[PDB]
Nucleic acid binder design. Structure first.
Lengths: 68, 104, 145, 141, 53, 187, 141, 46
RNA sequence: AACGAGACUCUGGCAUGCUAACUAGUUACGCGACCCCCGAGCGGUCGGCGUCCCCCAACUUCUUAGAGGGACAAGUGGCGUUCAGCCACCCGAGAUUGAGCAAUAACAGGUCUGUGAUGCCCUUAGAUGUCGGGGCUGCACGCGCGCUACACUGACUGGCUCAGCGUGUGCCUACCCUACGCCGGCAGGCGCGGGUAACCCGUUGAACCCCAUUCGUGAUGGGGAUCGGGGAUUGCAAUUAUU
């Protein structure tokens, strides 16, 4: 199968959260709309993967520190 | 007097034909020529399949080449003197344009 | 039933009186499935009965129709000898007459020594076939000296 | 009012469209009674919805079905889906939504593919063999 | 000079040859191309054919 | 009313499964009652999905086999249909009871795995017991019809009736009693 | 009752008996010797085959009019076995189709129509719907 | 014949045949013993 | 930090939401026409059947094809140095669709018979640069890729009813795809129309399969190699048999 996320996804998600933490939340369908206006992303299929890992990171940041 | 008069367009590339065709509709609508909207005909595909090797040695691989052709129709209700005006602007890209004086 | 005779002799050949009549008479050479049906259709015989159920005058009606097709209006395009080379006639050839008609054809080709006659004499394939890989009937030969 | 609906069903390349309207209980496929579609080994497959729901639910409407494409068996499955999908769409528009739920639940508890399509289509052939996965023979000495 | 200096060439591999290089083997008659198969793979991009699948 | 479906002609409610290891793998009654042994269902897509297929359709799939018969499922539904009509005349019993008891008698319960002419005895699972039973009695019906005036509909009825009583005239019982004899020598 | 309301195989046998009882349909002299199509191995089993061919042909012209001799040879086409080589599709005899269409025009059941081809008359339409009622009544519905 | 002329006396039984049917383009085969490579076992090592 | 991987491009499955069609359809009626009475009931307003025919009717569900939408391991429960991830399940058209393109470094791999790509060597008027005939097919024998079968889960003779991808008047080079009518058992022949193509062949009446009949365990009505005689079509020419 394999669902592991490549460094192009994981680095873009971290840089979005460092700059726009106050805009983001737990709803994937709202995060998917925010990430489309704060960044230039070449593909719809890449935009969905970035908003997915951003949604995973927000639910971690609500519990404690993330080292990056 | 007026006629019912027909224009047809053809190309390989789609998105240049879109901008050519949209400009023909605008120039007709602003002059009230009662234009009938773009009819999309079925797409046509040409195909050629060849061995890759120049000499007949090796494992038996093939190349699959194709070309696609796109076609449209628009109909106007107007004099023969003014299709000659509107069928002369924005036509700069590699698109065929052909017109016939009665087909409706 | 009538316990009637169930093997019968027709043209110097034996017929089993036990098959359907249209498939019993194809034991004669020169009479295939296609020709046997048309002969019984002109002879006014019911195809449903077994060959041992024909009467003595019914077999004589079939035999006299097989030997003279053109007088009972069987077409010319049906026949197995067309414009016979030596006398120009149209007919059907049967039984031991078919053996001799082929025997005369192979000797006629050999006497003038045409290519057909030489291939028939040397025992090789007569029509257009290749001979490198098919029709093998000898023995395997070893490479040793 | 005038009171009618048009809906479709599919399998492989076959498509069937059913029109139904306020009426007395007629059902036809290509102008023929559905008791007389040719592969009668499968006659219980196109009877399934009316045998399962009962004829009292069909008594208010006349249904006419048209079908083309695919082969003999794929068309029975297209006809079957068009009829059961038409009745629930007619009930949704013109009667109470509480009665739509009875129809949809009884159909799906017997068989999916009375109401949802089957997505399977052919694989394309590839060079070096007779089909999609098979390959020609290999030899060495 | 001879009066019989040619033989009929109205069909078969004697009639036709490549438009680029005059060769007679493996040429393409499809859509009016009349190129050799090795000359076609060389000019396919300029003629306007592409591969996608 | 629609809670009882007679498979054309034959009732399912009176059927019984008498081996408790197989009740989960022989699909009969309730949601598994249908009018015909033919569906387009996607049973191949996951490992145990196979166990939800009605047992009369599994018999119908395994019958369209031997090279010249691949894909011919409409012919294979009428073989099963005419076999069940002959079973009812010979026995006086429900044809679904004869099929269920033939499956319960024919599946082997010990077998020997291969390790180097050398073998070791092992247990057989209930899914492999029902898979083995169908293949053995389809093979028994197929081998008997190959040069006789007997139709395959008559041979499939004879094979199921002999298996439902364990007579050892059937192919399936001789092969089961061979596999368990060989494995008993490899303990 | 219309031709679309009855099972088609005994409709062909009922219509074949009506033609053969009338005494008006003419037949060719060679009806007992022809092979009926290029791909057959033997002549037909029934002496009455020409009346059955005419009855089926009238039923085809009712459902899809405007046919001609070429399109009738595609309706009666079938597979040819080529001995040791693979099999292919093959068309029917042209002379049989042309003489069957000319025999139905002599009964006033058929016309050559505008544009090109042939169709049933109102008299032909009447005689087919009259036999469809006889086929339905024979089942005591 | 492709290199020589073969003479024919035209008998009346030859009527309707081609002239080329009586003058043959090859010699009938008669075999010499098989050589190296003719069978899989025939292999040579120095 | 760079290339390969992945992303990327084409393709399959979903939209009764958008744009809008006499080279695509449906529904309906001003209606008009043929057939049947089987139908509450008449031979009817009203019923049934239609690739029977107009619309200066309404429209886009079915066909075409442009723009956007949709899926993320996103939701819930377990397991994980509680990270990275992995397993089951709900909801859903859908929780692995299938191809294309592809790195650094190699091989005495194949191709001079693809080329007006090419070095060196050979030949060059009794030519290694055009016509006539023959061969590439020759047959004791060994090997490779395949087609048809050994039958009754079949073969034969009738009847009924369903596809999708494509190609089409050759620009030197001289040929295309075919409806309809007539003659012939058949292959085939004559006449006369349409198509440079969503327009004509064409609603592309495909085969297995489906329904009824005959045969009866017999190298048999399974199998169709080998070989005799006759008739058409291509072509300048068919014998070593074009089809």
């Amino acid at each position: 199968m394999g669902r592991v996320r490549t460094k192009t996804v994981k680095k873009a998600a971290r840089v979005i959260i460092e700059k726009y933490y106050t805009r983001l939340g737990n709803d994937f369908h709202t995060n998917k709309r925010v990430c489309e206006e704060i960044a230039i992303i070449p593909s719809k299929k890449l935009r969905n993967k970035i908003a997915g890992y951003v949604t995973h990171l927000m639910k971690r940041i609500q519990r404690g520190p993330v080292r990056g | 007097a007026i006629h019912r008069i027909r224009i047809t367009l053809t190309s390989r590339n789609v998105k240049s034909l879109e901008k050519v065709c949209a400009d023909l509709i605008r120039g007709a609508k602003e002059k009230n020529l009662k234009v009938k909207g773009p009819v999309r005909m079925p797409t046509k595909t040409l195909r050629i399949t060849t061995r890759k090797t120049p000499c007949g040695e090796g494992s038996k691989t093939w190349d699959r080449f194709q070309m696609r052709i796109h076609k449209r129709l628009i109909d106007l209700h107007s004099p023969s003197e003014i299709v000659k005006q509107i069928t002369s602007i924005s036509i700069e890209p590699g698109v065929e344009v052909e017109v016939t004086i009665a087909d409706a | 039933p009538e316990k009637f005779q169930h093997i019968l002799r027709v043209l110097n050949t034996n017929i089993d009186g036990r098959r359907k009549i249209a498939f019993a008479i194809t034991a004669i050479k020169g009479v295939g499935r296609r020709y046997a049906h048309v002969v019984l259709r002109k002879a006014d015989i019911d195809l449903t009965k077994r060959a041992g159920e024909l009467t003595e005058d019914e077999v004589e009606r079939v035999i006299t129709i097989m030997q003279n097709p053109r007088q009972y209006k069987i077409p010319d395009w049906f026949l197995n000898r067309q414009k016979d080379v030596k006398d120009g006639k149209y007919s059907q050839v049967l039984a031991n007459g078919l053996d001799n008609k082929l025997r005369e054809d192979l000797e006629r080709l050999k006497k003038i020594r045409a290519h057909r006659g030489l291939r028939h004499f040397w025992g090789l394939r007569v029509r257009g076939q290749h001979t490198k890989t098919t029709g093998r009937r000898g023995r395997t030969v070893g490479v040793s000296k | 009012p005038l009171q009618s609906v048009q809906v479709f069903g599919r399998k492989k390349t076959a498509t069937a469209v059913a029109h139904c309207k306020r009426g007395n209980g007629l059902i036809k496929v290509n102008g023929r009674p559905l008791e007389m579609i040719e592969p009668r080994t499968l006659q219980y497959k196109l009877l399934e919805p009316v045998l399962l729901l009962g004829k009292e639910r069909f008594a208010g409407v006349d249904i006419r079905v048209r079908v083309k494409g695919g082969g003999h068996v794929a068309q029975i499955y297209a006809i079957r889906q068009s009829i059961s999908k038409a009745l629930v769409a007619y009930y949704q528009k013109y009667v109470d939504e509480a009665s739509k739920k009875e129809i949809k639940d009884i159909l799906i508890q017997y068989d999916r593919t009375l109401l949802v399509a089957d997505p399977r289509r052919c694989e394309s052939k590839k060079f070096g063999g007779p089909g999609a996965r098979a390959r020609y023979q290999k030899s060495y000495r | 000079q001879q009066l019989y200096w040619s033989h009929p060439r109205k069909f078969g591999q004697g009639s036709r040859s490549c438009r680029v290089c005059s060769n007679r083997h493996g040429l393409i008659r499809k859509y009016g191309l009349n190129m050799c198969r090795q000359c076609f793979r060389q000019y396919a991009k300029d003629i306007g054919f592409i591969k996608l699948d | 009313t629609p809670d009882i479906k007679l498979f054309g002609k034959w009732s399912t409610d009176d059927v019984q499964i008498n081996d408790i290891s197989l009740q989960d793998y022989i699909a009969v009654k309730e949601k598994y009652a249908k009018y015909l042994p033919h569906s387009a269902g996607r049973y191949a897509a996951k490992r145990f999905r196979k166990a939800q297929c009605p047992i009369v359709e599994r018999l119908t799939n395994s019958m369209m086999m031997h090279g010249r018969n691949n894909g011919k499922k409409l012919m294979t539904v009428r073989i099963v249909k005419h076999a069940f009509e002959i079973i009812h005349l010979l026995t006086g019993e429900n044809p679904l009871q004869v099929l269920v008891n033939a499956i319960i008698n024919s599946g082997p319960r010990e077998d020997s795995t291969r390790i180097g002419v050398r073998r070791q005895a092992v247990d057989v699972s209930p899914l492999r017991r029902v898979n083995q039973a169908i293949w053995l009695l389809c093979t028994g019906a197929r081998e008997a019809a190959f040069r006789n005036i007997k139709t395959i509909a008559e041979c499939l009825a004879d094979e199921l009736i002999n298996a439902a009583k364990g007579s050892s005239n059937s192919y399936a019982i001789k092969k089961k009693d061979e596999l368990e004899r060989v494995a008993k020598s490899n303990r | 009752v219309t031709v679309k309301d009855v099972n088609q195989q005994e409709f062909v046998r009922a219509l074949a008996a009506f033609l053969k009882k009338s005494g008006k349909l003419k037949v060719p002299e060679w009806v007992d010797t022809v092979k009926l199509a290029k791909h057959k191995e033997l002549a037909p089993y029934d002496e009455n085959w020409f009346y059955t061919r005419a009855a089926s042909t009238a039923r085809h012209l009712y459902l899809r009019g405007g046919a001609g001799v070429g399109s009738m040879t595609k309706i009666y086409g079938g597979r040819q076995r080529n001995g040791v080589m693979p099999s292919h599709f093959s068309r029917g005899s042209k002379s049989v189709a042309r003489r069957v269409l000319q025999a139905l025009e002599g009964l006033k059941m058929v016309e050559k129509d505008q544009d090109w081809g042939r169709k049933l008359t109102p008299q032909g339409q009447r005689d087919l719907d009259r036999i469809a009622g006889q086929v339905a009544a024979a089942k005591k519905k | 014949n492709g290199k020589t002329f073969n003479q024919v006396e035209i008998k009346p039984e030859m009527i309707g045949h081609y002239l080329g049917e009586f003058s043959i383009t090859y010699k009938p085969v008669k075999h010499g013993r098989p050589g190296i490579g003719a069978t899989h076992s025939s292999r040579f090592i120095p």
